[PDB]
Amino acid sequence: AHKSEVAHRFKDLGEENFKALVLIAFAQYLQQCPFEDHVKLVNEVTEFAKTCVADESAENCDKSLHTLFGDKLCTVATLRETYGEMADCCAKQEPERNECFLQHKDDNPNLPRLVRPEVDVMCTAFHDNEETFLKKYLYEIARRHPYFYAPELLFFAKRYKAAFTECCQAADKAACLLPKLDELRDEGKASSAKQRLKCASLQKFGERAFKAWAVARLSQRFPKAEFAEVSKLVTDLTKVHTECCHGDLLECADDRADLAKYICENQDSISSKLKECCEKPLLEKSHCIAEVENDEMPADLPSLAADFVESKDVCKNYAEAKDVFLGMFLYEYARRHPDYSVVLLLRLAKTYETTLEKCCAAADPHECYAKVFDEFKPLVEEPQNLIKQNCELFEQLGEYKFQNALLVRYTKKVPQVSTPTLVEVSRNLGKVGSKCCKHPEAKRMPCAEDYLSVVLNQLCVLHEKTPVSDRVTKCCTESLVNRRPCFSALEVDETYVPKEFNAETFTFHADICTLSEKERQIKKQTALVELVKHKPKATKEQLKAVMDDFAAFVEKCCKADDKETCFAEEGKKLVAASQAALG
Numbered sequence: 001a002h003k004s005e006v007a008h009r010f011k012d013l014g015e016e017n018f019k020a021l022v023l024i025a026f027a028q029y030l031q032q033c034p035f036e037d038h039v040k041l042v043n044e045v046t047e048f049a050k051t052c053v054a055d056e057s058a059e060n061c062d063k064s065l066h067t068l069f070g071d072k073l074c075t076v077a078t079l080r081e082t083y084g085e086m087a088d089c090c091a092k093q094e095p096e097r098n099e100c101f102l103q104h105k106d107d108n109p110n111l112p113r114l115v116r117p118e119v120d121v122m123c124t125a126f127h128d129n130e131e132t133f134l135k136k137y138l139y140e141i142a143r144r145h146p147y148f149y150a151p152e153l154l155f156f157a158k159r160y161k162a163a164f165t166e167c168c169q170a171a172d173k174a175a176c177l178l179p180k181l182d183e184l185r186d187e188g189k190a191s192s193a194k195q196r197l198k199c200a201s202l203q204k205f206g207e208r209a210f211k212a213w214a215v216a217r218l219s220q221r222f223p224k225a226e227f228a229e230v231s232k233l234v235t236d237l238t239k240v241h242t243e244c245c246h247g248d249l250l251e252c253a254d255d256r257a258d259l260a261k262y263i264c265e266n267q268d269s270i271s272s273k274l275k276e277c278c279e280k281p282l283l284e285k286s287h288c289i290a291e292v293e294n295d296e297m298p299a300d301l302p303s304l305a306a307d308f309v310e311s312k313d314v315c316k317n318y319a320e321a322k323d324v325f326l327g328m329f330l331y332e333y334a335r336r337h338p339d340y341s342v343v344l345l346l347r348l349a350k351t352y353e354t355t356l357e358k359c360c361a362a363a364d365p366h367e368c369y370a371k372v373f374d375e376f377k378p379l380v381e382e383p384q385n386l387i388k389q390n391c392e393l394f395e396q397l398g399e400y401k402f403q404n405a406l407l408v409r410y411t412k413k414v415p416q417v418s419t420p421t422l423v424e425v426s427r428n429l430g431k432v433g434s435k436c437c438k439h440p441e442a443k444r445m446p447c448a449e450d451y452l453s454v455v456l457n458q459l460c461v462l463h464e465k466t467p468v469s470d471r472v473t474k475c476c477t478e479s480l481v482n483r484r485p486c487f488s489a490l491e492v493d494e495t496y497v498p499k500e501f502n503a504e505t506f507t508f509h510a511d512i513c514t515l516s517e518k519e520r521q522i523k524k525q526t527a528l529v530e531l532v533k534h535k536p537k538a539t540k541e542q543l544k545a546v547m548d549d550f551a552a553f554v555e556k557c558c559k560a561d562d563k564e565t566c567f568a569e570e571g572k573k574l575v576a577a578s579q580a581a582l583g
């Protein structure tokens, strides 16, 4: 490794991966550079790397990656003209220089949004020049997400390439390709949002809160590992997470690689499921391990009662190292419950903590805390019930109707949220139902936690930028442990003044018949939100009557001879009848 670091990276990563990562890396700093300029830099950097591979002692090959990268950045002629004060980073020595470059990454570069070309256009461009087509994908995404972990982008790119490879040869290219591009896009946005969320919550709630989350998550994953091993892993994972949040690619990657290396050298102390991951290339190890399914739980683990309720030295053991004792509780509880969300486990540990804090100061602590496990039962059943109720509702409704039930519900709880956000959130909330309810009960809560975190965070981001409800701000600014229950606790808004009727809002044209399924659904759901906003006291029942009238009306107007007029004409009377029925 140490000698020529660039040659070592090139040897470990291989040429293709090396070139792709260098491209991503430059694109994340030189966010305004044309694709051609980056290609040229990458080629120059790769040709240099090859000289160091041929001879570690070759000129400049003993410089650090940071030194070489920044030197190269500082050779961009238009640096000052295009990036202004970032060019001032070049006047600094290289620990300070990289830090300076790091600070000048732009989280919002004001580039035009990415647009999806026609399927035939995409597949043709892919065919004409696969390498260019894919490298453009890397470039365009990376420079819009300068902190997105480069290797993970590589994994997105490889699936992006696989979508095109398969689907551009398919019979129905679009039917193959589009859902795959939609999934990558959604996963991409989600991953990027989750990354920022975790780093934001790290600095807001502190390292201890993160460690607790990690103990719970790591214990679920590796239930056979000893506590001391989970605790070591929590320490290392915290350093990784902290340094990766700081945002330097190489520092983050080396931390992750070091952790992945340790995990792979200690599989017998950690998990029986890591063998395949640990055989993979260095580049993919940590990513692979991050996605590993939970190990099987050890057979016939005893109750937690003995150590955490019935032992005579609960209070003594607690008081000598509270976080360690609480970590042990959380470790024991989590390893036995891969079916819980991490946040539920944290509710249990917080409950236990509050009880020990209250009870251990009592004259007779054991009498005080003896039934603490009763206190867990309603906390556990709340998400379990909510899941049962929602999955049962999804099954009876199907996804679209499920989204509409949510739409009506949430519009009534928080009517001042913009229509498109209510639509988006409700639609996405329906998708988590569609996805997570396909799991047996044992896996539903972690699924829902994962996907709810995406959907609820997206809502909070939108709400941060354009706030309308103190209640939503409260839930969004609360602990992540209480985020979801806070939202669940939202009550119908009874102070809400109905939105004035707008004619155009409830006016429909024959274009509605030719819209895609999605386009039609969003148009219908948009009106449904507006209907609730105009008539918040309308019941599910009364709404269903208007909705059934509307549904008949569109089925009618879309198919029976020369017809934009019914849409106007029946539109007049559907509206009138609805207005009276909800009047």
Ligand SMILES: CC[C@@](O)(C(=O)O)c1cc2n(c(=O)c1CO)Cc1cc3c(N)cccc3nc1-2
Pocket (backbone or CB within 6 Å): 113, 114, 115, 116, 117, 137, 141, 145, 148, 153, 156, 181, 182, 184, 185, 187, 188, 189, 190, 191, 192
């Ligand atoms: C290049 C693929 C595509 O053009 C597509 O058609 O799906 C596309 C891809 C992506 N985005 C887009 O808005 C569009 C177009 O809306 C946002 C976005 C965020 C990403 C992220 N944070 C990480 C990784 C990949 C991402 N990809 C996309």
Ligand SMILES: CCCCCCCCCCCCCC(=O)O
Pocket (backbone or CB within 6 Å): 006, 009, 021, 022, 025, 045, 065, 068, 069, 151, 249, 250, 253, 254, 256, 257, 260, 282, 283, 284, 285, 286, 287
């Ligand atoms: C000067 C060119 C710099 C090229 C950037 C190389 C980036 C290497 C990161 C890949 C290591 C991944 C480790 C991991 O995530 O487990």
Ligand SMILES: CCCCCCCCCCCCCC(=O)O
Pocket (backbone or CB within 6 Å): 205, 208, 209, 211, 212, 213, 215, 231, 234, 322, 323, 324, 326, 327, 330, 346, 349, 350, 353, 479, 481
């Ligand atoms: C060395 C192991 C560190 C474990 C830290 C103690 C865990 C206590 C759980 C309390 C729950 C807090 C959750 C939170 O703050 O978001």
Ligand SMILES: CCCCCCCCCCCCCC(=O)O
Pocket (backbone or CB within 6 Å): 341, 343, 344, 383, 386, 387, 390, 391, 406, 429, 430, 432, 433, 436, 445, 448, 449, 452, 484, 485
């Ligand atoms: C509206 C879509 C519902 C999706 C499935 C129901 C999920 C209910 C909340 C589950 C708990 C998430 C994690 C937690 O708070 O403990």
Ligand SMILES: CCCCCCCCCCCCCC(=O)O
Pocket (backbone or CB within 6 Å): 386, 390, 406, 410, 411, 414, 417, 421, 422, 425, 452, 459, 484, 487, 488, 490
């Ligand atoms: C703009 C209003 C946002 C809607 C509030 C989000 C509520 C999500 C809570 C988790 C969903 C649980 C299932 C349910 O709806 O009962």
Ligand SMILES: CCCCCCCCCCCCCC(=O)O
Pocket (backbone or CB within 6 Å): 506, 524, 525, 527, 528, 531, 534, 546, 547, 550, 551, 574, 575, 578, 579
């Ligand atoms: C007060 C004017 C009411 C006009 C009719 C409003 C229709 C709202 C959208 C109906 C959504 C139904 C969606 C569906 O079931 O396919």
